[PDB]
Structure formats: C-alpha cells, structure tokens
Amino acid sequence: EEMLRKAVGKGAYEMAYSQQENALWLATSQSRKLDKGGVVYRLDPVTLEVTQAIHNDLKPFGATINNTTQTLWFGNTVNSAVTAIDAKTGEVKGRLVLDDRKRTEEVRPLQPRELVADDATNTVYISGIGKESVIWVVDGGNIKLKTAIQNTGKMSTGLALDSEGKRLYTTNADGELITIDTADNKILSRKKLLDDGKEHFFINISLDTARQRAFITDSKAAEVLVVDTRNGNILAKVAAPESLAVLFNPARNEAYVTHRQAGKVSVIDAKSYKVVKTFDTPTHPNSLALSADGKTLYVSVKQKSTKQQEATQPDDVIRIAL
C-alpha cells in the first residue's frame, strides 16, 4: 500500500528490526574508494529518519539481530569478519576475524555473506562464501569461533535457521539445498533441487517453520522455489523475475522477493503460490526486513554503481505498509 522512500546513505545492504527498541537498523558500506569503514544507521520505523549513526572501522554488509540479547550482528564482507553491536546503547561490543589469511593470487579468503542468530543458544551462524564455502559457528556470548562446517559447496550464500527444530539450511551455486543439525554442526543431507541440466544459483532462503517449507530465490532462473524442508521435494514454482532476497511473513502467509535487475519487489501468496502484487522499487532493490507484527515491509534500494564508476547519490530505504 503506502510507500515511503527515504535517502539514508551510500552502500546500503541488509537490515534488522527490534520490537523492544522500536527501531530499524541499516548497514552501509559508504563509498568504496573515499570511506574507510562504514556506518550502521538506526532508523525511525515510521519516518525512516536517522536516529543514530554508528561509525564502524570495518564496512558492514550482512545484518541480523539476536532478539533475546538485543545484539546486532553484522557481516564485514571485505574484511572476513563479524561485528557485534549493542542495539540499546549502540556500542560496538567486539569483532571476530573469520578468515585472517592474506589475499594473494592463489589464496582468496572466504567472505561472510548471510547471518542468522539463535536466540535460544546465543549462537551466530555465518555463511562464508567462496569456491569451497563454509558455515562459521560463532559463540554469541564471548564472540569466539566454535567451528567451521565444511563442504557447503560453491558460493553457499543462503542461510536460514529453524531454532526449535535445531535445523540449519544453506543454498549454493551448485543448485543443492543443504540441511544441518545445529546440535552437532553436521550436514544431515544435501539434495539437488532441480535436475533440468540448467544452472541454478540459489542465493537466499527463508523458512516457514510452522509448515516445514522454505522459499528459495534463484538468480539464474525466472522462478522462485517453494521446497518441503523434510525431504527437499518441490512444492511450487512461482513465476517471477530473477530473484535475490526472500522473506516469508507468517503473520500474512506471504513471501516478499527482491528483483535487482527488474527493479521490483514481488508479493507471493503462499497459499495459491502466485504473485499477487508487485511493488515498484526502481534501481536495484537489495535486502528486506519486516517489523515484528508483520505489517510493515522495509526494502533497501541501491543506486546503479559499478566497479569503475560509483554512485553520486545515496541509497534509499522504502517503507511499505502491508
């Protein structure tokens, strides 16, 4: 319905929402050439006005929040690290380097991508992408590395957590869905979701744990997958443009999907498995966030920026009253 576009800053990416603080956070990397480090912006959930600017010496990209500890967790992609920030005070609690290797021509350090927090065990799971990706398991209590789950495939970007079921899911560029037992950090199964001889980059995944199903985006194909998390069988193929982020809303039984190249956001009705609404978010939408009540959707919208020519305008956040 009602849409509000608000400029925040350059290099906007992922977001996190806190009902306790009644606030929204946006990770910004700022200018890649002029700025060393980045800023995490605290935003008014109604007006999107900056209510706090947290300067970071490492650029933040991915974002998640532990609702029990009220601790924000950000992925430092270009530094192979994760940052913990107190959501109430805004103080940086500490950082952990996940790949301290120096970059050469043969050595390419793994970079954090997605982050999910287990409020029950205070555990942070971080997807470290690369040729041979991993899942980093971080102790939220003392910001220390517990272990690194091996062999998640090529560019295993996706990450979603089933806290009660003790199941962790990740998706990669090998077209497979990987299920992990969080009780011992071991891969329980992996299944190639499609056997059509086509290339499939499953970038993101969002869970409907109540019905044991997952929504998975694909940047190489023009359809969003709905998958049964018990066996990996495909429940539906929703026709939509090439997709990046996906967020399921249990309060409305809908899934929202960003289309970077199309410049749009799709609303997928999870009962009929059809796109019932498309939001106009011109110029590369990126990440999604929902208010606690499921009534407000937040979309980070990025300007066109290249490796040679950066954007001269800041990125935006769009607030959509559902």
Side-chain angles (χ1 to χ4, degrees):
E1 254 169 55
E2 303 103 63
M3 296 177 70
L4 176 59
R5 188 194 275 268
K6 188 78 201 168
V8 181
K10 292 183 178 180
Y13 290 95
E14 278 184 27
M15 304 158 90
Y17 192 93
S18 171
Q19 187 277 325
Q20 294 195 7
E21 294 299 296
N22 189 35
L24 173 74
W25 286 272
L26 170 66
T28 61
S29 59
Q30 298 291 307
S31 175
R32 188 199 175 89
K33 72 187 289 176
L34 189 89
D35 292 74
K36 287 297 287 214
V39 179
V40 171
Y41 288 101
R42 187 180 67 189
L43 305 179
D44 180 286
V46 179
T47 69
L48 298 179
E49 291 288 340
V50 172
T51 59
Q52 213 186 46
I54 307 168
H55 299 273
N56 285 259
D57 61 356
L58 303 195
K59 298 179 179 290
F61 293 83
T64 196
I65 181 179
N66 188 322
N67 297 288
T68 294
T69 66
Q70 289 299 296
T71 300
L72 299 162
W73 291 89
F74 293 98
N76 307 120
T77 299
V78 302
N79 296 287
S80 297
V82 55
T83 300
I85 298 179
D86 187 297
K88 182 180 185 171
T89 64
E91 186 187 355
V92 174
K93 300 182 68 169
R95 287 187 183 95
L96 172 62
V97 179
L98 301 159
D99 194 333
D100 65 337
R101 294 180 300 175
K102 191 63 180 301
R103 179 196 173 101
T104 66
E105 189 60 285
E106 305 88 55
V107 175
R108 291 203 69 256
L110 301 182
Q111 295 176 333
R113 184 61 171 261
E114 300 303 310
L115 300 86
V116 291
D118 192 354
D119 295 359
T121 62
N122 193 11
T123 308
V124 181
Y125 302 91
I126 304 163
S127 56
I129 65 179
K131 179 183 176 177
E132 300 185 1
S133 303
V134 301
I135 296 298
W136 286 304
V137 184
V138 173
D139 189 323
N142 52 10
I143 319 173
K144 293 177 180 179
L145 180 66
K146 287 185 176 185
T147 187
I149 304 169
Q150 298 299 308
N151 304 319
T152 55
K154 165 185 164 179
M155 297 295 289
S156 184
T157 57
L159 197 62
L161 173 70
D162 183 3
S163 183
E164 184 67 24
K166 301 177 183 172
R167 291 299 183 267
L168 185 68
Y169 306 88
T170 177
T171 55
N172 56 28
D174 294 323
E176 60 196 5
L177 164 74
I178 297 181
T179 308
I180 296 176
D181 192 342
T182 68
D184 53 0
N185 302 317
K186 291 179 176 50
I187 297 179
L188 292 178
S189 62
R190 67 178 76 197
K191 179 174 181 185
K192 194 170 295 295
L193 296 173
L194 288 172
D195 198 1
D196 54 356
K198 301 178 185 178
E199 64 177 3
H200 295 284
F201 200 156
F202 297 146
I203 290 184
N204 280 306
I205 175 176
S206 183
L207 293 180
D208 176 9
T209 61
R211 296 168 185 92
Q212 291 172 344
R213 48 179 188 167
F215 297 79
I216 302 171
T217 50
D218 196 338
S219 73
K220 297 300 179 185
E223 57 187 15
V224 176
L225 299 188
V226 187
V227 176
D228 186 12
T229 60
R230 298 172 294 178
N231 48 45
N233 189 9
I234 293 190
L235 298 172
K237 299 175 181 305
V238 186
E242 281 176 350
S243 50
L244 194 159
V246 57
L247 185 52
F248 176 77
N249 189 1
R252 299 179 61 91
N253 200 279
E254 302 177 314
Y256 316 109
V257 166
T258 55
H259 305 295
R260 172 181 163 107
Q261 297 285 333
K264 299 167 185 287
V265 171
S266 288
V267 181
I268 296 176
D269 175 54
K271 185 186 289 182
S272 60
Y273 294 118
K274 288 185 158 178
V275 175
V276 300
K277 194 168 190 177
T278 301
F279 287 118
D280 288 331
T281 58
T283 317
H284 313 143
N286 194 265
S287 301
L288 298 163
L290 275 168
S291 59
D293 59 357
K295 296 181 176 181
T296 306
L297 180 65
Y298 298 96
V299 190
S300 67
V301 179
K302 304 179 63 65
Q303 308 287 333
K304 179 185 189 302
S305 65
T306 64
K307 305 179 180 181
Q308 290 293 108
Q309 186 178 31
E310 264 168 295
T312 59
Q313 300 297 314
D315 294 335
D316 301 308
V317 168
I318 295 187
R319 177 192 183 274
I320 301 179
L322 301 166

